[PDB]
């Protein structure tokens, strides 16, 4: 067997998946994996506008180079809180990772064929692997607006603790975090727990969601993320990994435990070794030797020889993140573990290529890939693999990366398909799992339940659609899975139908109706219909459809043969009237009595086969005989024999029917003597007689022929018997009118209410007037279930007794997952937090607008370092790289543009007034970060007057330890429109001495101005009479993130400023004996339309004139 | 002696205040911030420095995290796959995020002390 | 200790009616961030208009004067006289319920720091 391995093999009984590309269920996940598509997409703005954080340079401050991710199309804010009894405040507090973990765990439990009640209160374990807690840093970024239950809603441990809390589980609840391997490490811990035997079940789950850019920025700082946006496994395009969203729940149990519990097995986790990389060349750098040792130890612990092909796996789900250095290490480890000791290759396929690198749940994603591959025997491909990486080719000799849904390689007979799962988290924690496919050496009511009536209606609709899509699935298996292998929930509705067409029509009828029940009770009150209530063709459908009913009919025939030859045979209605289509009238005693008795005997036998505990009350005639059988002391054959022999009332306190000119009268008074005489020679459950009132309601005197005679001669005290039964058993749950219902419904229920004053108990009839026997019995079972959960009856035992051939298969895998309400969206988008995640493009020279910025007040936050701003190295003073004084002006003008855009206004004219440069910004090094905070308050928004006055201040801080200080300030007076402004330039001065630009900049460098590259940009200049004029390069500057040009490249404006110095000092005259920097500007006026036109037109070379007013 | 061996690590941390503090301002984030603040690195870096090859879990079961890590270390050692296991825990008050979160539920003691029973 | 992060962890006392000063606040520019709910401000339930609890128009004046005090303290100056000019209440703050949180952000830019004058 497969359970003989040194350590008990763990088996995946169910799985629940929320994977990108609409893969919100294991079946869709497998379809995607074996038929991959370009799932990855730009990060949705609903999550966070990555364009607000995107930048080609991954190391850029507060930016990410990976604007793509394998994101879930589901609205994670949506959540069926009513399902988990979670309040709205707590649900908003909940991390979407935890909510999706709950949903996926329930989906796996359903797919595993396990009920919440069955697992409620048990020792089931939980091991959740999450690497990212983006919600905890997003919902809590603004300490204000934090919900009351935020601590428990976002705390990582709650990811598993809340799963256990909802499911009432008592096993260990770990929220593992080993980075990318977290989920597979959790799988290992679950395996250990299950092997210890302290937990009958373990939920190895993982969760990674992209809710904020914190993780993206952190990982892109190291270039870990893939700028191409995809995890190109072992490819020459390997530039990192693409973050993916996924929440995977895998139900794990011991193979023996699963088999004894009869759960639908997915795959066998034979062994799951865990190891960690040593002091590698970097914390992020994996160790090939460590992973090779991990694989070897994992195979050895499984009793598997790595060298031998039979023991060696055919597939290997690799970490395969597309990392430039990790992938070669992993390939080397795999090759050395499986080869290097020396011929078909070994298939290696990383799930992270198709669904993306889902971080904490990456291990479980690979595990699901391997599980589905081994179960279906198909090696899923890897979407992103075009050319083998040169660093991976040396170790790729004995390995193949499948780009198609390649069929599984050849296998020795008796050897299950074997696959391997590998997951490496940064830091080096490597988890390796060895998986093997499991070798595997009358219709029940279709029950559906939900925590909400709307969810139940959606359940019915989805089940109808699934039936339309899967008419091939056996009805018995489907109903049994929905009954025993599916959870029962407060809102219930059970459907009735012999076959798939009938079940579909009944589903449509139930959907139209909308009538659904709401919120250990197997006890029933056996009520038996008497003579005269029989309908034509009773049991015809049951006899013709159920072989068990046919065997009961054989028993009835044997009882008929048991009659003495004096009366034998009372003609066999079993073969004369119990025939479909004919259904001839049966009112004659000779047929009506035995027919009703056989009907009730079959019904009670079926109910007992369903493990229904009875409290029996006798009716009249056939009902009395069948009830006497139901006591458990009278054999069925004896009861049907008595009914055959006899073939040849106070129903309620306010309803009686005394028959006559019949039974209980002088007509049958003498006729019962021969019946009693022949009965003398012809033949455990609480049981209450109605022939006698509490005196012969006993288990020994009911067998006397005198009692059988009195059955037809005494006035049946059915009301008194019902009163006795109900009052004695005050804890009675329901009463069933066994037989040809309706015969006693109204009088019996009225008697129950009268005895239990004002108390109405459930009533049910298993054979309805002239209706299909299958439908009537299924409806009775439906009533029982809707009223008293799965405890009402045992469907497993019923199918064991009925139709033993083809025992029902747990098809809960194929059944649709529970339709989560998703009506309300639970999230904490604090408006500051929302403006952080969302917002305007990260404008260059300004950064991201502050979260607390109004249309009237703005504060652009930036941390400028020279290397990020390619052109900023040019403006160097005294060797130090100094932020240009024109840089503050450009920032102020761009702030004016953004303000006008916020109000939808367009600036026809842009003036600056009384500007001042209080403190110059000094950059110690090209990598030094200097914070710049451009505050801007529009003191006068007069768009009615076509003007806008804005007080702006560029605050600066040269070091993280320093305080924020003013670098520039002033005013901006904008002439705006709802969607020639400047004086024409002065006539060029007649006489002007040509200026040697190179010599001019040499002199400036001597004085201290170390202008370089883009900041020089002075095509020509000529000075005279304290004036200067010439041509300067109006070089354009555009922000790629914002995708639009800027009004001024600070280089051009700083060159214009240099024009003043040139006028003041000729080249080589040394008039500029000291380094002058701007410290105040009375007015800068710019026409943004003309500047933008020049920038976009390419005529950057523009002319200039300047007056050195004071010298 | 332990360099390169199969010694295991099981770290129990409930709070990652630094990860929410150092990363509250996405700007000024250091280059190695991801590995410096990522919770799993709490154990992975211990093993990396000591060259260990045993399991490196950074457990988080809230207050019980460290004792749960002790349990996992016990299981690992009983399996015999690790000659040694570091059952460690860490909780530091570096930011008010955890304080505000817990005080929102009144979990924290306003008196400032855990007056047992 | 990113200076914004440091000013978040550290900083001035959480002035009432103003909250905590923004991390990116200069001695010249200030932005007090607060999320006022009536039950937190014991006295705010009194000013109710049309049944709704409305933040008093005098509340904005008090907040502005306290902002002036904090600004002067930042520059070490003491206000002998406090004038307000051309004040406007563009939009009244409406509190749906005593637990409802309404964000108030008192931006304040000292256009003319003339302590010499």
Numbering used by the authors:
A (entry chain A): 2 to 343, 353 to 451, 471 to 548, 555 to 683, 723 to 735, 761 to 782, 794 to 1089, 1100 to 1231
B (entry chain B): 119 to 235
C (entry chain B): 939 to 1055
Provide excerpts from the study.
In LovB, the β-ketoacyl synthase (KS), malonyl-acetyl transferase (MAT), dehydratase (DH), methyltransferase (CMeT), acyl carrier protein (ACP), and ketoreductase (KR) domains are active, except for the enoyl reductase (ER) domain. LovB terminates with a condensation (CON) domain commonly found in nonribosomal peptide synthetases. In DML biosynthesis by LovB, the initiation and elongation of the intermediate chain are carried out by the KS, MAT, and ACP domains. ß-Ketoacyl modification cycles are also repeated, but the tailoring domain usage during each iteration is highly programmed and permutative.
The structure of LovB adopts an X-shaped dimer architecture, and the LovBC complex reveals the position of LovC which binds to the MAT domain of LovB, forming two complete L-shaped catalytic chambers. The LovBC complex adopts an X shape in the front view with two wings. The adoption of a pseudo-twofold face-to-face symmetry of LovB, in connection with LovC, creates two L-shaped catalytic chambers. The chamber is chimeric, with the KS, and MAT domains coming from one chain, and the DH, CMeT, ψKR, ψER, and KR domains from another. The LovB–C interface is approximately 522 Å2, which is mainly contributed by several residues in the loop region of LovC and α helices of the MAT domain. These observations suggest that the loop within LovC and the helix of MAT domain of LovB are essential for the formation of the LovBC complex. Figure 4e shows that the interface mutation abolished the synthesis of DML acid, in spite of the full catalytic competence of the mutant. We conclude that the formation of the LovBC complex is essential for the integrity of the catalytic chamber to the complete total synthesis of DML acid.
